[PDB]
Short mmCIF file of C-alpha atoms and ligand atoms in Angstrom, two decimals:
data_model
loop_
_atom_site.label_atom_id
_atom_site.label_comp_id
_atom_site.label_asym_id
_atom_site.label_seq_id
_atom_site.Cartn_x
_atom_site.Cartn_y
_atom_site.Cartn_z
CA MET A 1 29.67 20.93 14.71
CA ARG A 2 30.60 24.61 14.78
CA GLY A 3 33.92 25.57 13.20
CA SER A 4 34.05 21.90 12.29
CA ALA A 5 31.05 21.20 10.07
CA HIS A 6 29.88 17.64 9.50
CA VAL A 7 29.12 16.91 5.85
CA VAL A 8 27.16 13.78 4.96
CA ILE A 9 27.03 12.30 1.46
CA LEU A 10 23.96 10.10 1.02
CA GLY A 11 24.40 7.38 -1.62
CA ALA A 12 27.69 5.83 -2.78
CA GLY A 13 27.04 5.58 -6.53
CA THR A 14 28.27 7.39 -9.64
CA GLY A 15 27.82 10.84 -8.07
CA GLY A 16 28.19 10.08 -4.37
CA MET A 17 31.42 8.05 -4.52
CA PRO A 18 33.39 10.88 -6.11
CA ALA A 19 31.48 13.44 -4.08
CA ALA A 20 32.79 12.01 -0.79
CA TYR A 21 36.33 11.95 -2.09
CA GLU A 22 36.09 15.47 -3.52
CA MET A 23 34.39 16.73 -0.40
CA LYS A 24 37.07 15.41 1.93
CA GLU A 25 39.72 16.80 -0.38
CA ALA A 26 38.00 20.20 -0.35
CA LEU A 27 37.26 20.48 3.37
CA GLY A 28 40.50 19.03 4.71
CA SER A 29 41.23 17.54 8.12
CA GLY A 30 39.21 20.05 10.14
CA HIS A 31 35.89 18.73 8.88
CA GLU A 32 34.21 15.37 9.22
CA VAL A 33 32.98 13.77 6.00
CA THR A 34 30.61 10.81 6.27
CA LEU A 35 29.43 8.69 3.34
CA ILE A 36 26.15 6.83 3.99
CA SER A 37 24.82 4.22 1.56
CA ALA A 38 22.51 1.20 1.30
CA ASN A 39 25.09 -1.35 0.09
CA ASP A 40 28.67 -1.91 1.26
CA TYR A 41 29.93 -1.97 -2.33
CA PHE A 42 30.33 0.31 -5.34
CA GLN A 43 29.09 -0.97 -8.69
CA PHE A 44 29.81 0.38 -12.16
CA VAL A 45 26.23 0.83 -13.37
CA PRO A 46 26.92 1.12 -17.15
CA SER A 47 28.30 -2.44 -17.04
CA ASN A 48 25.07 -4.01 -15.77
CA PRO A 49 23.47 -4.77 -19.17
CA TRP A 50 26.53 -6.95 -19.85
CA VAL A 51 26.14 -8.79 -16.58
CA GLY A 52 22.52 -9.27 -17.72
CA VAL A 53 23.66 -11.33 -20.71
CA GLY A 54 26.60 -12.91 -18.86
CA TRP A 55 29.35 -10.93 -20.60
CA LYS A 56 30.72 -9.68 -17.26
CA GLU A 57 30.86 -10.95 -13.67
CA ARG A 58 29.88 -9.11 -10.51
CA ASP A 59 33.53 -9.02 -9.39
CA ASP A 60 34.60 -7.29 -12.59
CA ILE A 61 32.40 -4.28 -11.91
CA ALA A 62 31.91 -4.09 -8.13
CA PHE A 63 34.16 -3.68 -5.11
CA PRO A 64 33.94 -3.17 -1.31
CA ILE A 65 33.91 0.54 -0.45
CA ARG A 66 35.04 0.74 3.21
CA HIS A 67 38.81 0.41 2.87
CA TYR A 68 39.11 2.84 -0.04
CA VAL A 69 37.35 5.80 1.60
CA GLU A 70 38.60 5.27 5.15
CA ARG A 71 42.21 5.54 4.09
CA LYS A 72 41.18 8.95 2.79
CA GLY A 73 39.68 9.98 6.12
CA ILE A 74 36.07 9.40 5.10
CA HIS A 75 33.62 7.71 7.49
CA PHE A 76 31.51 4.98 5.85
CA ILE A 77 28.16 3.66 7.10
CA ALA A 78 26.99 0.72 4.99
CA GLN A 79 23.38 1.31 5.89
CA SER A 80 20.17 2.60 4.30
CA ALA A 81 18.61 5.90 5.45
CA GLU A 82 14.93 5.33 6.24
CA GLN A 83 14.13 8.85 7.25
CA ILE A 84 15.48 12.37 6.95
CA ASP A 85 14.45 15.12 9.36
CA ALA A 86 15.46 18.37 7.67
CA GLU A 87 14.53 20.54 10.66
CA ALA A 88 16.54 18.67 13.28
CA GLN A 89 19.05 17.74 10.54
CA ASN A 90 18.97 14.10 11.63
CA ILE A 91 19.04 10.99 9.46
CA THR A 92 17.43 7.84 10.87
CA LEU A 93 19.18 4.66 9.70
CA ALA A 94 17.67 1.25 9.03
CA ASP A 95 19.18 -0.06 12.25
CA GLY A 96 17.53 2.61 14.34
CA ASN A 97 20.64 4.76 14.79
CA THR A 98 20.62 8.48 14.07
CA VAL A 99 23.17 10.62 12.27
CA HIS A 100 23.32 14.42 12.52
CA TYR A 101 24.61 16.67 9.77
CA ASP A 102 25.35 20.32 9.23
CA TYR A 103 25.38 19.87 5.47
CA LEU A 104 23.67 17.06 3.56
CA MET A 105 24.57 16.03 0.00
CA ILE A 106 21.91 13.83 -1.58
CA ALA A 107 23.13 11.40 -4.20
CA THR A 108 20.58 8.63 -3.86
CA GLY A 109 19.93 7.99 -7.55
CA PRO A 110 16.61 6.52 -8.64
CA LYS A 111 13.89 4.38 -7.13
CA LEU A 112 13.03 1.80 -9.80
CA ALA A 113 9.29 2.37 -9.86
CA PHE A 114 8.07 -1.14 -10.71
CA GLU A 115 4.86 -0.30 -8.83
CA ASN A 116 3.74 1.77 -11.87
CA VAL A 117 3.20 -1.54 -13.66
CA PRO A 118 1.66 -4.38 -11.59
CA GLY A 119 3.56 -7.59 -12.35
CA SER A 120 6.66 -5.77 -13.60
CA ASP A 121 8.85 -6.30 -10.51
CA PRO A 122 11.65 -8.75 -11.36
CA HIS A 123 10.55 -10.88 -8.40
CA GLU A 124 6.89 -10.95 -9.50
CA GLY A 125 7.20 -12.09 -13.12
CA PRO A 126 9.29 -12.77 -16.26
CA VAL A 127 10.01 -9.09 -16.97
CA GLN A 128 13.48 -8.61 -15.50
CA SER A 129 15.79 -5.63 -14.89
CA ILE A 130 19.43 -4.69 -15.65
CA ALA A 131 19.66 -1.52 -13.54
CA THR A 132 21.65 -3.04 -10.66
CA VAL A 133 24.12 -5.90 -10.46
CA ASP A 134 21.66 -7.75 -8.21
CA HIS A 135 18.97 -7.41 -10.87
CA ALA A 136 21.30 -8.09 -13.79
CA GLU A 137 22.67 -11.24 -12.15
CA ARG A 138 19.03 -12.24 -11.79
CA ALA A 139 18.21 -11.27 -15.42
CA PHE A 140 21.02 -13.50 -16.67
CA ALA A 141 19.72 -16.38 -14.58
CA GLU A 142 16.32 -16.16 -16.28
CA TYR A 143 18.14 -15.82 -19.58
CA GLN A 144 19.66 -19.26 -19.05
CA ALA A 145 16.17 -20.54 -18.26
CA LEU A 146 15.09 -19.13 -21.63
CA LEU A 147 18.04 -20.94 -23.23
CA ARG A 148 16.83 -24.18 -21.69
CA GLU A 149 13.24 -23.51 -22.78
CA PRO A 150 13.24 -21.10 -25.74
CA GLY A 151 10.22 -18.78 -25.70
CA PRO A 152 9.15 -15.25 -26.72
CA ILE A 153 11.51 -12.42 -25.72
CA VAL A 154 10.34 -8.92 -24.85
CA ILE A 155 12.81 -6.10 -24.20
CA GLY A 156 12.11 -2.35 -24.03
CA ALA A 157 11.35 0.69 -21.85
CA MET A 158 8.23 1.53 -19.83
CA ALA A 159 6.27 4.73 -19.79
CA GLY A 160 8.11 7.33 -17.72
CA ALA A 161 11.49 5.75 -18.43
CA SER A 162 14.33 8.16 -19.13
CA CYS A 163 17.28 5.85 -19.69
CA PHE A 164 16.61 4.24 -23.08
CA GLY A 165 20.09 3.46 -24.38
CA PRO A 166 20.49 0.37 -22.16
CA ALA A 167 17.21 -1.06 -23.49
CA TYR A 168 18.54 -0.92 -27.03
CA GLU A 169 21.92 -2.17 -25.87
CA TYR A 170 20.34 -5.08 -24.01
CA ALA A 171 18.19 -6.08 -26.98
CA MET A 172 21.20 -6.13 -29.32
CA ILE A 173 23.59 -8.04 -27.03
CA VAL A 174 20.95 -10.68 -26.32
CA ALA A 175 20.44 -11.07 -30.06
CA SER A 176 24.21 -11.10 -30.37
CA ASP A 177 24.68 -13.71 -27.68
CA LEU A 178 21.87 -15.89 -28.97
CA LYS A 179 23.53 -15.93 -32.39
CA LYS A 180 26.88 -16.80 -30.79
CA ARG A 181 25.35 -19.67 -28.79
CA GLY A 182 23.89 -20.55 -32.16
CA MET A 183 20.39 -20.47 -30.73
CA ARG A 184 18.76 -17.36 -32.18
CA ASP A 185 16.68 -19.65 -34.40
CA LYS A 186 14.78 -21.17 -31.45
CA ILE A 187 13.13 -17.87 -30.45
CA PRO A 188 9.38 -17.63 -31.32
CA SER A 189 9.44 -13.84 -31.33
CA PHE A 190 11.67 -10.93 -30.34
CA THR A 191 9.79 -7.73 -29.64
CA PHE A 192 10.93 -4.29 -28.65
CA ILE A 193 8.42 -2.18 -26.80
CA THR A 194 9.18 1.44 -25.95
CA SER A 195 7.36 4.50 -24.65
CA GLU A 196 9.32 6.68 -27.07
CA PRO A 197 7.27 8.42 -29.76
CA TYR A 198 9.74 6.90 -32.26
CA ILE A 199 12.72 4.53 -32.35
CA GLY A 200 15.89 6.35 -31.33
CA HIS A 201 14.06 9.21 -29.55
CA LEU A 202 16.09 8.30 -26.49
CA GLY A 203 14.17 10.85 -24.43
CA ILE A 204 16.16 13.60 -26.11
CA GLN A 205 14.23 13.94 -29.38
CA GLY A 206 16.83 11.82 -31.15
CA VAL A 207 20.50 12.56 -31.68
CA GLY A 208 22.18 12.47 -35.09
CA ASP A 209 20.68 9.54 -36.98
CA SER A 210 19.87 7.51 -33.88
CA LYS A 211 16.46 6.99 -35.43
CA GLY A 212 17.60 5.39 -38.67
CA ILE A 213 20.54 3.55 -37.21
CA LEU A 214 18.69 2.05 -34.26
CA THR A 215 15.73 1.32 -36.55
CA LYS A 216 17.92 -0.47 -39.09
CA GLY A 217 19.74 -2.35 -36.32
CA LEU A 218 16.62 -3.83 -34.70
CA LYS A 219 15.56 -4.83 -38.20
CA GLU A 220 18.95 -6.46 -38.93
CA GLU A 221 18.54 -8.61 -35.82
CA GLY A 222 14.95 -9.61 -36.60
CA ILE A 223 13.44 -7.58 -33.76
CA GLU A 224 9.96 -6.16 -34.34
CA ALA A 225 9.43 -2.74 -32.76
CA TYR A 226 6.55 -0.69 -31.42
CA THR A 227 6.68 2.93 -30.28
CA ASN A 228 4.23 4.95 -28.21
CA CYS A 229 3.56 2.04 -25.86
CA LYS A 230 2.68 1.85 -22.22
CA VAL A 231 2.47 -1.45 -20.41
CA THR A 232 -0.69 -1.60 -18.30
CA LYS A 233 0.22 -4.80 -16.45
CA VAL A 234 2.36 -7.91 -16.40
CA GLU A 235 0.39 -10.99 -15.49
CA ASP A 236 0.14 -14.71 -16.20
CA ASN A 237 3.52 -14.43 -17.92
CA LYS A 238 1.83 -12.08 -20.38
CA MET A 239 2.59 -8.44 -21.02
CA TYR A 240 -0.44 -6.24 -21.64
CA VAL A 241 0.57 -3.35 -23.92
CA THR A 242 -1.49 -0.27 -24.84
CA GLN A 243 -0.34 1.73 -27.88
CA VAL A 244 -1.47 5.32 -28.39
CA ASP A 245 -1.34 7.96 -31.14
CA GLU A 246 0.10 11.49 -31.14
CA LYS A 247 -2.93 12.59 -29.11
CA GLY A 248 -3.03 9.88 -26.46
CA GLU A 249 -6.07 8.17 -27.92
CA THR A 250 -5.59 4.40 -28.21
CA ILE A 251 -4.80 2.84 -31.59
CA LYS A 252 -4.36 -0.69 -30.37
CA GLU A 253 -3.84 -3.07 -27.50
CA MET A 254 -1.64 -6.13 -27.47
CA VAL A 255 -1.12 -9.12 -25.25
CA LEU A 256 2.41 -10.40 -25.48
CA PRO A 257 3.50 -13.74 -24.03
CA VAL A 258 6.89 -13.44 -22.30
CA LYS A 259 9.28 -16.26 -21.46
CA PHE A 260 12.04 -13.70 -20.90
CA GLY A 261 11.87 -9.92 -20.85
CA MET A 262 13.56 -6.78 -19.62
CA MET A 263 11.85 -3.41 -19.44
CA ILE A 264 13.53 -0.23 -18.27
CA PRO A 265 11.25 1.20 -15.58
CA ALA A 266 10.38 4.79 -14.76
CA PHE A 267 12.70 6.38 -12.17
CA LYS A 268 11.33 8.10 -9.06
CA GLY A 269 13.15 9.63 -6.11
CA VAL A 270 13.94 7.17 -3.34
CA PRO A 271 11.45 7.20 -0.48
CA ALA A 272 13.61 8.61 2.35
CA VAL A 273 14.29 11.66 0.21
CA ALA A 274 10.87 11.91 -1.42
CA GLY A 275 9.45 11.80 2.09
CA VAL A 276 11.18 15.00 3.20
CA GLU A 277 8.35 17.53 3.30
CA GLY A 278 8.85 20.32 0.78
CA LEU A 279 12.06 18.88 -0.53
CA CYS A 280 10.92 17.23 -3.76
CA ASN A 281 8.66 17.48 -6.79
CA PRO A 282 5.79 14.96 -7.02
CA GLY A 283 8.25 12.39 -8.45
CA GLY A 284 10.54 12.52 -5.42
CA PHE A 285 13.15 14.58 -7.16
CA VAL A 286 15.01 17.16 -5.13
CA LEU A 287 14.14 20.68 -6.29
CA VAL A 288 17.50 22.47 -6.49
CA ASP A 289 18.92 25.69 -7.86
CA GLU A 290 21.77 26.10 -10.36
CA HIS A 291 24.31 25.66 -7.58
CA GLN A 292 22.76 22.26 -6.62
CA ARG A 293 21.33 23.68 -3.36
CA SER A 294 17.82 22.57 -2.36
CA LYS A 295 15.29 25.38 -2.68
CA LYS A 296 13.81 24.76 0.77
CA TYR A 297 16.90 23.94 2.86
CA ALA A 298 20.13 25.88 2.50
CA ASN A 299 22.28 23.11 4.03
CA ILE A 300 20.89 20.42 1.69
CA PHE A 301 22.52 19.89 -1.71
CA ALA A 302 21.66 17.28 -4.34
CA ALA A 303 23.44 15.70 -7.32
CA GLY A 304 22.85 12.96 -9.88
CA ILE A 305 19.57 11.27 -10.83
CA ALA A 306 18.26 12.51 -7.47
CA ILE A 307 17.76 16.10 -8.63
CA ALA A 308 14.76 17.47 -10.46
CA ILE A 309 15.19 18.64 -14.06
CA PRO A 310 12.25 20.28 -15.89
CA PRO A 311 10.90 18.52 -19.04
CA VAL A 312 11.26 20.32 -22.37
CA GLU A 313 8.75 18.22 -24.26
CA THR A 314 5.60 16.26 -23.59
CA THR A 315 5.42 12.90 -25.43
CA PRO A 316 2.20 10.97 -26.27
CA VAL A 317 3.34 8.37 -23.74
CA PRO A 318 5.20 9.98 -20.81
CA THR A 319 8.99 9.88 -21.17
CA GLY A 320 11.89 11.58 -19.41
CA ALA A 321 15.26 13.03 -20.34
CA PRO A 322 18.24 11.09 -18.98
CA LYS A 323 20.76 12.32 -16.46
CA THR A 324 24.13 10.99 -17.54
CA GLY A 325 27.70 10.58 -16.29
CA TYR A 326 29.42 13.76 -17.35
CA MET A 327 26.65 16.10 -16.22
CA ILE A 328 26.30 14.21 -12.94
CA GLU A 329 30.00 14.88 -12.30
CA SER A 330 29.53 18.63 -12.90
CA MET A 331 26.62 18.54 -10.48
CA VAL A 332 28.85 16.82 -7.91
CA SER A 333 31.86 19.14 -8.29
CA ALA A 334 29.68 22.25 -8.22
CA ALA A 335 27.94 21.11 -5.04
CA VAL A 336 31.27 20.40 -3.36
CA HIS A 337 32.62 23.85 -4.31
CA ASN A 338 29.43 25.53 -3.10
CA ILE A 339 29.34 23.84 0.31
CA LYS A 340 33.02 24.67 0.86
CA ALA A 341 32.29 28.31 0.02
CA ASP A 342 29.51 28.28 2.60
CA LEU A 343 31.89 26.82 5.19
CA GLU A 344 34.22 29.65 4.21
CA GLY A 345 31.85 32.59 3.94
CA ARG A 346 30.57 33.15 0.43
CA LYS A 347 27.84 31.97 -1.85
CA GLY A 348 29.46 29.53 -4.25
CA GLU A 349 28.67 30.72 -7.77
CA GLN A 350 29.52 27.39 -9.38
CA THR A 351 26.93 25.70 -11.56
CA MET A 352 26.32 22.40 -13.31
CA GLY A 353 27.11 24.02 -16.65
CA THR A 354 25.31 23.43 -19.92
CA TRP A 355 22.88 20.53 -19.92
CA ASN A 356 24.15 17.59 -21.90
CA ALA A 357 23.65 13.92 -22.53
CA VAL A 358 26.59 11.63 -23.23
CA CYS A 359 26.05 7.87 -23.53
CA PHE A 360 28.20 4.96 -24.60
CA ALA A 361 26.97 1.49 -25.46
CA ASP A 362 29.16 -1.49 -26.26
CA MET A 363 27.90 -4.30 -28.49
CA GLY A 364 30.96 -6.52 -28.16
CA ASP A 365 33.39 -5.51 -30.92
CA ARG A 366 31.97 -2.07 -31.60
CA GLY A 367 29.82 0.49 -29.84
CA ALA A 368 27.28 3.26 -30.24
CA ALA A 369 27.57 6.56 -28.44
CA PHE A 370 25.94 9.96 -28.60
CA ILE A 371 26.61 13.51 -27.46
CA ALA A 372 23.76 16.00 -27.23
CA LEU A 373 23.88 19.56 -25.89
CA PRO A 374 22.25 21.65 -24.82
CA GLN A 375 18.84 20.07 -24.11
CA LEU A 376 16.72 21.94 -26.69
CA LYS A 377 17.16 21.96 -30.49
CA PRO A 378 18.80 23.38 -32.43
CA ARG A 379 21.78 21.97 -30.50
CA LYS A 380 25.42 22.98 -30.47
CA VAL A 381 26.43 19.34 -30.53
CA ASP A 382 24.24 16.56 -31.81
CA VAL A 383 26.30 13.50 -32.63
CA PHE A 384 25.56 9.79 -32.85
CA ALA A 385 28.57 7.62 -33.59
CA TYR A 386 29.10 3.93 -34.15
CA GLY A 387 32.42 2.15 -34.41
CA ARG A 388 35.12 0.09 -32.76
CA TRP A 389 36.54 3.20 -31.07
CA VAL A 390 33.33 3.51 -29.03
CA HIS A 391 33.96 0.00 -27.70
CA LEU A 392 37.62 0.74 -26.97
CA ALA A 393 36.38 3.87 -25.26
CA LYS A 394 33.78 2.10 -23.10
CA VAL A 395 36.24 -0.57 -21.95
CA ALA A 396 38.74 2.15 -21.17
CA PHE A 397 36.43 4.38 -19.19
CA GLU A 398 35.18 1.59 -16.95
CA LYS A 399 38.75 0.62 -16.08
CA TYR A 400 39.61 4.26 -15.45
CA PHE A 401 36.53 4.93 -13.30
CA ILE A 402 36.77 1.88 -11.09
CA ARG A 403 40.46 2.65 -10.57
CA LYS A 404 39.73 6.28 -9.66
CA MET A 405 36.97 5.16 -7.29
CA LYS A 406 39.67 3.13 -5.54
CA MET A 407 42.59 5.60 -5.43
CA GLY A 408 40.45 8.70 -4.85
CA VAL A 409 39.76 11.93 -6.71
CA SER A 410 40.69 15.53 -5.87
CA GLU A 411 40.01 16.38 -8.71
CA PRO A 412 38.41 18.09 -11.69
CA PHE A 413 37.33 14.71 -12.99
CA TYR A 414 37.10 14.48 -16.79
CA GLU A 415 40.65 15.50 -17.45
CA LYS A 416 39.83 13.00 -20.20
CA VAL A 417 41.04 15.89 -22.33
CA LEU A 418 44.74 15.23 -21.86
CA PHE A 419 44.61 12.90 -24.87
CA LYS A 420 44.74 16.17 -26.80
CA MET A 421 47.20 18.23 -24.73
C1 FAD B 1 21.59 0.25 -16.79
C2 FAD B 1 22.00 1.69 -16.93
C3 FAD B 1 23.10 2.00 -17.72
C4 FAD B 1 23.62 3.30 -17.74
N1 FAD B 1 24.49 3.64 -18.74
C5 FAD B 1 25.11 4.87 -18.69
C6 FAD B 1 25.96 5.22 -19.72
O1 FAD B 1 26.50 4.32 -20.37
N2 FAD B 1 26.59 6.44 -19.66
C7 FAD B 1 26.25 7.37 -18.70
O2 FAD B 1 26.74 8.50 -18.76
N3 FAD B 1 25.22 7.10 -17.83
C8 FAD B 1 24.67 5.84 -17.80
N4 FAD B 1 23.60 5.58 -16.97
C9 FAD B 1 22.96 6.73 -16.26
C10 FAD B 1 23.62 7.13 -14.93
O3 FAD B 1 24.93 7.61 -15.11
C11 FAD B 1 23.65 6.02 -13.88
O4 FAD B 1 22.33 5.67 -13.53
C12 FAD B 1 24.41 6.49 -12.64
O5 FAD B 1 24.70 5.39 -11.80
C13 FAD B 1 23.66 7.56 -11.85
O6 FAD B 1 24.34 7.87 -10.65
P1 FAD B 1 23.61 8.48 -9.34
O7 FAD B 1 24.67 8.92 -8.38
O8 FAD B 1 22.67 9.62 -9.67
O9 FAD B 1 22.77 7.26 -8.75
P2 FAD B 1 23.31 5.79 -8.42
O10 FAD B 1 24.55 5.38 -9.17
O11 FAD B 1 22.18 4.81 -8.69
O12 FAD B 1 23.66 5.81 -6.85
C14 FAD B 1 22.66 5.99 -5.89
C15 FAD B 1 23.17 5.33 -4.63
O13 FAD B 1 22.36 5.68 -3.54
C16 FAD B 1 22.01 4.52 -2.82
N5 FAD B 1 20.77 4.79 -2.07
C17 FAD B 1 19.51 5.00 -2.54
N6 FAD B 1 18.70 5.24 -1.48
C18 FAD B 1 19.44 5.19 -0.35
C19 FAD B 1 19.12 5.35 0.99
N7 FAD B 1 17.85 5.46 1.37
N8 FAD B 1 20.12 5.24 1.93
C20 FAD B 1 21.41 4.95 1.54
N9 FAD B 1 21.73 4.79 0.21
C21 FAD B 1 20.75 4.92 -0.71
C22 FAD B 1 21.97 3.41 -3.84
O14 FAD B 1 22.21 2.15 -3.25
C23 FAD B 1 23.13 3.81 -4.72
O15 FAD B 1 24.33 3.35 -4.17
C24 FAD B 1 23.08 4.29 -16.92
C25 FAD B 1 22.00 3.96 -16.08
C26 FAD B 1 21.53 2.64 -16.03
C27 FAD B 1 20.59 2.18 -14.95
C1 LMT B 2 24.53 4.87 -26.58
C2 LMT B 2 23.03 4.70 -26.62
C3 LMT B 2 22.42 4.54 -28.00
C4 LMT B 2 21.82 3.21 -28.30
C5 LMT B 2 22.62 1.99 -27.92
C6 LMT B 2 23.02 1.05 -29.01
C7 LMT B 2 21.91 0.54 -29.93
C8 LMT B 2 22.33 -0.43 -31.05
C9 LMT B 2 22.97 0.17 -32.30
C10 LMT B 2 22.65 -0.50 -33.61
C11 LMT B 2 23.58 -0.28 -34.78
C12 LMT B 2 23.70 -1.42 -35.79
O1 LMT B 2 23.88 -1.06 -37.16
C13 LMT B 2 25.13 -0.66 -37.59
O2 LMT B 2 25.08 0.72 -37.79
C14 LMT B 2 26.06 1.33 -38.73
C15 LMT B 2 25.32 2.32 -39.50
O3 LMT B 2 25.72 3.64 -39.37
C16 LMT B 2 26.80 0.41 -39.69
O4 LMT B 2 28.17 0.87 -39.80
C17 LMT B 2 28.33 1.72 -40.86
O5 LMT B 2 28.87 3.05 -40.38
C18 LMT B 2 30.03 2.79 -39.60
C19 LMT B 2 30.55 4.03 -38.95
O6 LMT B 2 29.70 4.74 -38.14
C20 LMT B 2 31.09 2.08 -40.42
O7 LMT B 2 32.13 1.68 -39.57
C21 LMT B 2 30.54 0.87 -41.08
O8 LMT B 2 31.50 0.32 -41.99
C22 LMT B 2 29.30 1.15 -41.80
O9 LMT B 2 28.79 -0.02 -42.44
C23 LMT B 2 26.80 -0.96 -39.33
O10 LMT B 2 27.15 -1.81 -40.45
C24 LMT B 2 25.52 -1.42 -38.84
O11 LMT B 2 25.66 -2.79 -38.57
#
């Protein structure tokens, strides 16, 4: 309402959870902040691959949201938005109810676009998913069924995928956990299929020696690897793979039996957001400016996977650049600062900053991690590291993040630069 704006954050994930906290902190008691989200619980996404192999439980990485935000003055609706009317500024919930907003912050993350590949939905076939704790729990279940009836494994990333790290990570920890169970030997074949033009491309044209290190690792574990692949369909427990050359022309087609597989799907914008006329690109990604404001509606902001970022390269098989934790946080904090400025008179000049990708992967005792920035080469930072410290770092950041998501954040987040000062 007037002189008392109502700000809605849509999606309680890696961007939205902090965004609601930071928004309430910024706007104070004279403004209503509402967080709306499909599930009643927060989950630490980067931990899912480990749930997928049974190295972590749901309760280690997920918690009920309601108590933690409400004690901070935030309203929480554990309900999915089905429809967003940007003219009337009304959101229609699953249950029929309607919620009005003066400002809307979209943090809905990705739709997992299994529809791109018939058969590929985790509920339709043997190709599973580790993107959500629901899916990962399910992936682990099928993994036990593989352990009872050893059969070919296929792990990888589909065409259009943008988040490759986890595919590599999942392939290695499965290998690792097979070995530990002392049952690696029973596996007919272990294949890695990716839409990357080469191993370790990672949708960022490689970082450091990600190519040689990831290549040598898959080899070490006895995993055969194919690049430039699209999967045309999953069917009859078989994966139909088409492999192209640098020009798109086909150079072979395979038919891979799968007893247990996991392919990272392409990400699209969720439907309620994609369905807002004029809001999104053809993928369902919110077209926003440098201040995270939608280009069509001044009172709509967007942060996280939800936003549209232009491609810098066109790969033989379509691939996308990832949107990762640190940059998502800058998107969040900028959007908060820019709405507050609006509520207070000015255009917020705050931006996301320099594009960057930061990713950490834990293999058990040691980890791999990379930092790339900016998006185009030659970069200012281009580092791929492996070691125990990466593992210590992963473990530490999860603990930190889950804790912060419970106690709240003001709060220029990554003050993870006090370990210097
Ligand atoms: C398996 C995997 C591992 C990852 N590993 C890392 C990594 O190690 N490091 C890193 O920096 N990044 C990592 N990422 C990338 C990225 O940081 C995560 O995907 C992160 O969760 C993105 O946050 P987000 O806010 O954009 O979307 P999300 O975290 O997915 O949150 C979106 C939220 O919106 C909700 N939602 C969607 N539609 C609606 C609707 N209609 N109504 C209400 N709610 C809705 C969803 O339920 C969800 O709660 C990883 C990604 C994946 C999938
Ligand atoms: C974060 C997303 C990126 C992808 C996710 C993870 C994918 C899996 C990584 C596979 C790495 C396995 O291969 C591993 O690599 C490095 C090579 O530099 C080797 O490690 C080598 O360099 C490291 C330091 O960086 C030394 O500590 C080590 O003594 C040395 O042998 C390991 O002996 C080898 O076992």
